[PDB]
Design a protein around this ligand. Structure first.
Ligand SMILES: [Zn+2]
Lengths: 124, 119, 75, 107, 71, 74, 91, 147, 172, 186
RNA sequence: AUACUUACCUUAAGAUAUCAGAGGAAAGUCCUACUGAUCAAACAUGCGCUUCCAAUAGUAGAAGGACGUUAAGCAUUUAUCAUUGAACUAUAAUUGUUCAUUGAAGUCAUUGAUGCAAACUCCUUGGUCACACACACAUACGGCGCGGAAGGCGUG
RNA sequence: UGGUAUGUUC
C-alpha cells in the first residue's frame, strides 16, 4: 500500500491505522477521530502484543521468523495521546476516493435541506 | 526563538530521528507540527545492537518494531522498512541533520528579524 | 467543613508541627523536618531537615525541596 | 526589569513577554549557554540516557533545545565486569531540550 | 481549571493506591483541582502502620480512589 | 516565614549545594542566578557522585526538573 | 475535541478501561470529565497479575488511563458526521 | 482561570485589623458574597476578603478573646438587607392581594400551592433562598443574643 | 458554545451545571432515545447488495442444467408482500421481546425467595435499583396510577405460607 | 444488565449492550513501581581532563555564527542612522535664510507644490494680509523645492487668520497639492 | 403551542501566505479588483510514467481472517505462609522427612498454562472485462485493447 | 437584551 506524501492525520479518516504505544503494544483499527493531544478513536481496533516467551525469537541471529502474537479484540475504543508513540497506515478505506466524494456531496445536500426545513418550521 | 520553526524549514531532507527508545528512524522528512510531530515517508526504522555480546537491547522496542508490520521476515537485525511513519513529538531525543545544509541561512528567524527592524 | 490541602500545609507551617515527607520511591529516602514556607507548586522549605534511608540518616539544615518529588506530607 | 519578572505572565503584554525572554536569556541561568554561543567555546552536555556530548552551540531555545555542530557523543556500556567506551562523531545535530541534565561551559 | 467531582466522597473512608504499590486508607477531608487529597487517620495497608493525624497526598501519585463505605 | 522564591533570591551569590534526584550526585558551588522555573546557574562548582568528590567544574547550568533539593551550605 | 465528547456520550453504559498500571476495570460509567477522570460503578476489577474483585464505585484519575472501550453503537453518534449544518445561533 | 497552575497561585497568594479588612466576611458569611452568583447581585464586595484573616479569627475565637463590636458591625450590615427585602415581601403580598399562588418570604418570591413537594424542594434549595436563610437565622440569632 | 446535535439546538456558554441540566432534560431524552432507536433500526433493515461477480459458465456445466428442468418461481403480488412483510417484522419484534421466566414462577413460595428473586433485596444490585428510580418530580403521575405498590420485604420467614397448597396456587 | 443507571428507557438501554469482557493477558512491560529512567547517571567531570583535549586538538576553532551577523547588522545600521540623524540635527539662529523679521508675523506653509511658484503662493498669503517677506526652502544638496515656505506678513493678526484659513481648510489648494499652514514654530 | 413560577448560566486574547519592488495616508505603521518571486489549496488536464485488478479449455486459485474443529494433539512445567504438638534422620538451636491442630491471606483454570507442528472445515474480499489458444527474446523481451484502484511527476 | 431547564393553567 502506497500513501500520499502530503497526507496528515486529518486526511487519514477511515483508513486503517497501526498505532504503537509505549508498552510495546500495537492497536489496529479504522480511524474515526483525533485531537490536539493526539488521542485517537478507533473503530474495530484489535490489540496485539508479543509475549515475553515469544520475544527472544526476535533477537538477531530458519529463513522467516514466526511470532505467535497475543491479540485481544476490543471495539470502538478511544486511546490516550500520552501513550501513543507512532502511527503507521495498514489499509486503505472501503470506499474509493471518487465514491467518497459522491457520498459527501449527497450528505451536504440532505443536511442543507433539513436545516432549511427546520427554519421554515420554526417560523410557522 | 523557537527552534521548531527552524525544524519546519527542512521539509524535504533525509534526516535520522533518534527516539527515546533507542530506535532510529532514517527517512525523507515531510512536515513538522508545532509540537515537533515529524512525519517521515520512506522510512527505515532500526534498532542498534550494543556491540557487546552479553548486553541485550531494549526489549520493548524490539516488540514495537516487529509490531509495526514492516520487519523483513528473513532479516537478521531489527530493521523495518515502511512507507509513511508519523511520530508523536515527545518521543524524539535528537535529530541527526544532513551534512550539507547551511545553518547560517536557516537559523535566521524571520519574525525576530522582523520586529528588530521594526523596532 | 472542608479543609483544602493548601490549608493543611499552611497549618503545618503555622503550628510548626514536625512532618515526615515521603518522597516518591526508587530514590529511597524520607525527609523529616518542619515546614517554613510552601509554594503554589508545592515546593516546600524545611528547617532542621534530616534525610533518612529506607532513623540514623544525615542532617541537612534548611533545604528547598522541589515539589515534583513529594508524595506524602504527613505529621 | 524586576517587576516584569515578579508579575504573573498571564497579565503581561506581548512586548513584555518578548522583553522577559530577552532578559532571562541575557541576565539569567540560560545566559551560560548564550555566552558559549557567542564566545564559540565548546560545552559539555550530560543527557538523561547517560550519554555525554561535547559540542558548540549554534542556537538555543526556551526549552533548552539546541542546534549543535561538531557534536561528539561519548557513552559507556557495561554488563557485569565488562565495560566498553564508545564514541561517535556527528557533524550537525538537533537536541531536544528535555534530555539535558547539566550543561558545563569549558574554560 | 475544573475541580474534581468528589463532593460525594467527603468524610467517608477511602482506599487509594499511591504510586503503583502503596495503598493508603483514610477519611477524606479535602481535595484540590490537582486531585491532591488530605485524609485524617491514614494507615498504610500491607501489621499495617499508621501514618499520622493529618496527611496530604500529591495527586500526581494517586491512580484510583475507591471508597470503602456507603457513598 | 520564608517562601521558596524569596529563599532562592536570598541565596543569590551564596554557597549552596544542589543534589540531583538520580544518583545522589550533588554540585556544591556559588549560586549566580536563578530562573522562574528554578533553573540554576552555579559558579566554581564541585561534583559529588557519592560522598566522593570527583572534580571541580567551572560553570554549570542545572536544568530545572532534575534537582531534588537545594540547601544552604556552612 | 471529539474523543473526550465521545466519552461523555457513554454515560450510563458499561465501559471497560485499562489503566497505566495494568489494571482493567469494567463497570457503568457514572461521571466523566473534560480531564478524563472517570467514575465507574458496580465495577469488576482485574489487577495486573490477574486477580478479579468487585468494587462498588471507583474514581480513576484520567491521567492514568491507557484506553477506554465504549459500547459499539456509539459509532453512529452524530458527532462523527462530517457534513453538518447549524441553525444560526442566537444572541 | 486558564491553566491549573495559574489558578492555584491565586489561592496560595490569597492564603499568604479592619481598615483594609471587611468584617462581614470575617464574622460569618459576607452578604456581598452570598447572592453574588445570582441575578440579584448588587455587585462585587468592595472591601478585601482573605482566608488568612479567617484562620486568624478562628484562632482568636478559639482562644476566647472575642470582641463583640465586630458583631455589631456585622449586624449593622444585616439590617439593611433584612428591612429592604421585608419591604419588598410586603410589596409581594400587596401584589398577591391586588391558578393559585402564594408568596414565600423565606425566598422573597412566588410559589404555587398546586406544585408538588419535590419541585418546591428544588426551589427551596437555591442560592437566593439559602443566602436568605443563613442571613435570616443569623440575624435572629444575633438579636436574641443581644436580648 | 454548546450545541446538541440530537436536539439540534444551541445554548449559551456551557457551565457544567447548565449542561448537566440539559442532558437530563425530558425533551432531550426522548429525542436521544429516538435517535438511537432509528440507528439500530437502520443497521438492522439496511437492504443493500454485495457486488455480483458473474463467471462465464462452462459448457460442461451448461449441459447438466439443460437436463434438469426449469423450476417454477413463486412471487407474491404487491399488496400481498406489503401485508406479509408487516407480519414478518411484527413476528421478529415479538420474538425478540419474548423472555423465558418460568423458574421465577415455580419458586414463588420457597424460604429464601425474597432475597434472590425480588431483585430489589439482592446483595449485588440492591443498591443500584434503589439509585435507579428517578427524581420522581411529577407525583401527579404517581397519584394517577392508583395501584398499591406491594413490595416484598427481605424479612420474610417460612412461617408465613405454611401450607402453600390451600387454594393459594394456580396450575402451571 | 438487570437494571438501568441511565436516563433512557429499558429498550434504549438494551441497544447499548456492550461487547463481552476483555480477556486477560500477562504484561510485557515494567510494573509501575519499577519504572524509572536511568539512575546512575555518571559524572561529567571525568571528560574535562582527557576527552576535551582531544576535542580541542581536533576542532580548535569554531565556525563563525553568520546568522547572528544579520541581527547585528540591522542593529548597527539603526545606530548609524541615529548618528546621521544627530549630525543632521546638528546642522535656526545661524539658519540666516529664514532670519528675516520677528517670528510673530511668520507663518509656515507645508506640503505646497515643489513645482509651484513664488508669486502665486505669495498672492495666496496676500489674500489674508500684506506681505513683508516670502521664502521657499530648497534642498541644499540639489534645489528641489522642499514643499515648505515661510511667509512673514506685515501684521501677525492677518497671518493668524492666514494660518487658520490655509491649514484648517484641509490644506489650501496648491498648484497640484494640499498645502497646510500654521505658525513658524522655529 | 401560549403564558407564568423558579433554578442554573451569560465568554482567553490575537490573527488569515511569505519575501522583494513601485505608489499613497528621516523612523517605523497601514493600505494598494498594484506589480515580481516563492508557497499552499481547489478544479480541469496530461504523461509510451509505477504497482495491482481470480479456473470455466475449467470443479480451481490469491489475499486476509476464524474471538473454528481434530484436541485431554505431542513435549516440558506449576498448585500457599506462620504457630504448636508427635515420630524421624543428624555435624545441629533440632536444618531435612511424615501426621494432626490454630491463625492469615486465596482470579478462575490442571480437560489449564507454556513450547512445537500439522491436517481439515468454513467466512469476507476481486474486471471472475474484450480479443485471442498464438513460437518469443541481448539494447533481453512492441508497456501498440477498454476500464478501474492507488500513488509519483508536469502544465493550465 | 438572552439560553437551557423545571412544573402549573388553558
Ligand atoms: Zn440536547
Amino acid at each position: 500500500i502506497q500513501v500520499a506524501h502530503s497526507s496528515r492525520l486529518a486526511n487519514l479518516i477511515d483508513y486503517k491505522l497501526r498505532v504503537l504505544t509505549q508498552d510495546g503494544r500495537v492497536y489496529i483499527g479504522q480511524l474515526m477521530a483525533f485531537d490536539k493531544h493526539m488521542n485517537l478513536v478507533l473503530n474495530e481496533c484489535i490489540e496485539e502484543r508479543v509475549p515475553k516467551t515469544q520475544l527472544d525469537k526476535l533477537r538477531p541471529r530458519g529463513t522467516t521468523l514466526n511470532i505467535k502474537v497475543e491479540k485481544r479484540v476490543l471495539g470502538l475504543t478511544i486511546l490516550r495521546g500520552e501513550q501513543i508513540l507512532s502511527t503507521v497506515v495498514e489499509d486503505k478505506p472501503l470506499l474509493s476516493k471518487k465514491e467518497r466524494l459522491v457520498r459527501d456531496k449527497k450528505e451536504k445536500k440532505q443536511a442543507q435541506k433539513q436545516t432549511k426545513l427546520r427554519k421554515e418550521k420554526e417560523k410557522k | 526563538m523557537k527552534l521548531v520553526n527552524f525544524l519546519k524549514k527542512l521539509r524535504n531532507e533525509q534526516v535520522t530521528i533518534e527516539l527515546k527508545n533507542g530506535t532510529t528512524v532514517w527517512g525523507t522528512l515531510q512536515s513538522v507540527s508545532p509540537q515537533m510531530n515529524a512525519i517521515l515517508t520512506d522510512v527505515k526504522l532500526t534498532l542498534p545492537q550494543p556491540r557487546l555480546n552479553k548486553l541485550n537491547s531494549n526489549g520493548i522496542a524490539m516488540a514495537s518494531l516487529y509490531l509495526t508490520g514492516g520487519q523483513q521476515p528473513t532479516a537478521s537485525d531489527n530493521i523495518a522498512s515502511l512507507q509513511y511513519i508519523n511520530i508523536r513529538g515527545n518521543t524524539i531525543r535528537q535529530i541527526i541533520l544532513p551534512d550539507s545544509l547551511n545553518l547560517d541561512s536557516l537559523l535566521v528567524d524571520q519574525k525576530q528579524l522582523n520586529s528588530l527592524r521594526r523596532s | 467543613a472542608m479543609v483544602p490541602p493548601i490549608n493543611c500545609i499552611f497549618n503545618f507551617l503555622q503550628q510548626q508541627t514536625p512532618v515526615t515527607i515521603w518522597l516518591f520511591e526508587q530514590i529511597g529516602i524520607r525527609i523529616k523536618g518542619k515546614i517554613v514556607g510552601f509554594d503554589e507548586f508545592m515546593n516546600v522549605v524545611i528547617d532542621e531537615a534530616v534525610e533518612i534511608p529506607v532513623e540514623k540518616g544525615t542532617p541537612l539544615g534548611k533545604i528547598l525541596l522541589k515539589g515534583d518529588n513529594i508524595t506524602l506530607i504527613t505529621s | 526589569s524586576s517587576q516584569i519578572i515578579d508579575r504573573p505572565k498571564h497579565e503581561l503584554s506581548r512586548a513584555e513577554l518578548e522583553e522577559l525572554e530577552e532578559f532571562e536569556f541575557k541576565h539569567g541561568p540560560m545566559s551560560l549557554i548564550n555566552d558559549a554561543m557567542v564566545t564559540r567555546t565548546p560545552v559539555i552536555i550530560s543527557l538523561r540516557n547517560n550519554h555525554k556530548i561535547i559540542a558548540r552551540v549554534k542556537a538555543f531555545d526556551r526549552h533548552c533545545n539546541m542546534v549543535l555542530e561538531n557534536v561528539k557523543e561519548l557513552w559507556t556500556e557495561k554488563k557485569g565486569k565488562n565495560v566498553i567506551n564508545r564514541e561517535r562523531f556527528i557533524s550537525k545535530l538537533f537536541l531536544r531540550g528535555d534530555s539535558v541534565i547539566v550543561v558545563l561551559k569549558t574554560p | 481549571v475544573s475541580t474534581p467531582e468528589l463532593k460525594k466522597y467527603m468524610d467517608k473512608k477511602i482506599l487509594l493506591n499511591i504510586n503503583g504499590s502503596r495503598k493508603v486508607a483514610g477519611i477524606l477531608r479535602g481535595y484540590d483541582i490537582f486531585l491532591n487529597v488530605v485524609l485524617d487517620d491514614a494507615m498504610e495497608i500491607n501489621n499495617n502502620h499508621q501514618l499520622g493525624l493529618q496527611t496530604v497526598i500529591r495527586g500526581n501519585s494517586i491512580i484510583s480512589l475507591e471508597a470503602l463505605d456507603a457513598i | 516565614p520564608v517562601n521558596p522564591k524569596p529563599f532562592l533570591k536570598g541565596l543569590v551569590n551564596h554557597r549552596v549545594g544542589v543534589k540531583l534526584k538520580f544518583n545522589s550526585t550533588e554540585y556544591r558551588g556559588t549560586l549566580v542566578s536563578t530562573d522562574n522555573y528554578f533553573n540554576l546557574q552555579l559558579n566554581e562548582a564541585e561534583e559529588f557522585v557519592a560522598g566522593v568528590s570527583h572534580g571541580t567544574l567551572g560553570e554549570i547550568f542545572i536544568r530545572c526538573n532534575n534537582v531534588l533539593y537545594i540547601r544552604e551550605l556552612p | 475535541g471529539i474523543p473526550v465528547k465521545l466519552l461523555n456520550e457513554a454515560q450510563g453504559h458499561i465501559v471497560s478501561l485499562e489503566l497505566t498500571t495494568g489494571a482493567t476495570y469494567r463497570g457503568k460509567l457514572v461521571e466523566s470529565e473534560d480531564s478524563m477522570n472517570v467514575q465507574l460503578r458496580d465495577v469488576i476489577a482485574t489487577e495486573p497479575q490477574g486477580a478479579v474483585t468487585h468494587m462498588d464505585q471507583i474514581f480513576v484519575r484520567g491521567s492514568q488511563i491507557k484506553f477506554i472501550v465504549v459500547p459499539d453503537l456509539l459509532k453512529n453518534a452524530p458527532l462523527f458526521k462530517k457534513n453538518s449544518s447549524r441553525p444560526m445561533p442566537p444572541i | 482561570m486558564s491553566t491549573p497552575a495559574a489558578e492555584q497561585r491565586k489561592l496560595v497568594e490569597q492564603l499568604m485589623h479592619d481598615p483594609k479588612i471587611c468584617k462581614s466576611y470575617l464574622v460569618g458569611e459576607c452578604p456581598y458574597d452570598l447572592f453574588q452568583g445570582t441575578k440579584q447581585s448588587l455587585g462585587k464586595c468592595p472591601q478585601m476578603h482573605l482566608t488568612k484573616h479567617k484562620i486568624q479569627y478562628e484562632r482568636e475565637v478559639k482562644q476566647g478573646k472575642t470582641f463583640p463590636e465586630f458583631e455589631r458591625e456585622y449586624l449593622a450590615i444585616l439590617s439593611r438587607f433584612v428591612n429592604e427585602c421585608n419591604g419588598q415581601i410586603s410589596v409581594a403580598l400587596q401584589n398577591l392581594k391586588h391558578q393559585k399562588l402564594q408568596v414565600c418570604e423565606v425566598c422573597g418570591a412566588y410559589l404555587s400551592r398546586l406544585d408538588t413537594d419535590r419541585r418546591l424542594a428544588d426551589h427551596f434549595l437555591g442560592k437566593i433562598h439559602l443566602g436568605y436563610v443563613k442571613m435570616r437565622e443569623d440575624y435572629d440569632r444575633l438579636m436574641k443574643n443581644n436580648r | 458554545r454548546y450545541y446538541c446535535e440530537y436536539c439540534h439546538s444551541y445554548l449559551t456558554h456551557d457551565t457544567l451545571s447548565v449542561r448537566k441540566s440539559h442532558l437530563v432534560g425530558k425533551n432531550h431524552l426522548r429525542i436521544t432515545a429516538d435517535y438511537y432507536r432509528n440507528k439500530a433500526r437502520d443497521i438492522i433493515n439496511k437492504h443493500n447488495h454485495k457486488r455480483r461477480h458473474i463467471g462465464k459458465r462452462g459448457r460442461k456445466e451448461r449441459e447438466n442444467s439443460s437436463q434438469n428442468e426449469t423450476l417454477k418461481v413463486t412471487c407474491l403480488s404487491n399488496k400481498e408482500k406489503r401485508h406479509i412483510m408487516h407480519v414478518k417484522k411484527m413476528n421478529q419484534k415479538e420474538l425478540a421481546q419474548t423472555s423465558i421466566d418460568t423458574l421465577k414462577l415455580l419458586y414463588d413460595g420457597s424460604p429464601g425467595y425474597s432475597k434472590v428473586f425480588v431483585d430489589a433485596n439482592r446483595f449485588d444490585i440492591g443498591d443500584l435499583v434503589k439509585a435507579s428510580k428517578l427524581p420522581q418530580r411529577a407525583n401527579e403521575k404517581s397519584a394517577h396510577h392508583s395501584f398499591k405498590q406491594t413490595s416484598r420485604s427481605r424479612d420474610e420467614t417460612c412461617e408465613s405460607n405454611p401450607f402453600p397448597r390451600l387454594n393459594n396456587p394456580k396450575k402451571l | 444488565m438487570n437494571y438501568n443507571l441511565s436516563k433512557y428507557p429499558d429498550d434504549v438501554s438494551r441497544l447499548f449492550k456492550p461487547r463481552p469482557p476483555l480477556s486477560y493477558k500477562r504484561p510485557t512491560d515494567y510494573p509501575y513501581a519499577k519504572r524509572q529512567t536511568n539512575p546512575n547517571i555518571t559524572g561529567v567531570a571525568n571528560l574535562l581532563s582527557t576527552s576535551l583535549k582531544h576535542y580541542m586538538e581536533e576542532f580548535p576553532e569554531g565556525s563563525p555564527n553568520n546568522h547572528l551577523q544579520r541581527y547585528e547588522d540591522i542593529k548597527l545600521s539603526k545606530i548609524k542612522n541615529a548618528q546621521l540623524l544627530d549630525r543632521r540635527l546638528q546642522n535656526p539662529n545661524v539658519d540666516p535664510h529664514i532670519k528675516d523679521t520677528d517670528p510673530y508675523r511668520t507663518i509656515f506653509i507645508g506640503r505646497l507644490p515643489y513645482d509651484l511658484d513664488e508669486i502665486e503662493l505669495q498672492k495666496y498669503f496676500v489674500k489674508f494680509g500684506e506681505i513683508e517677506k516670502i521664502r521657499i526652502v530648497k534642498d541644499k544638496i540639489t534645489q528641489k523645492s522642499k514643499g515648505y515656505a515661510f511667509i512673514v506678513f506685515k501684521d501677525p493678526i492677518s497671518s493668524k487668520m492666514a494660518f487658520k484659513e490655509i491649514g484648517v481648510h484641509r490644506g489650501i489648494q496648491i498648484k497640484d497639492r494640499i498645502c497646510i499652514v500654521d505658525i513658524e514654530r522655529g
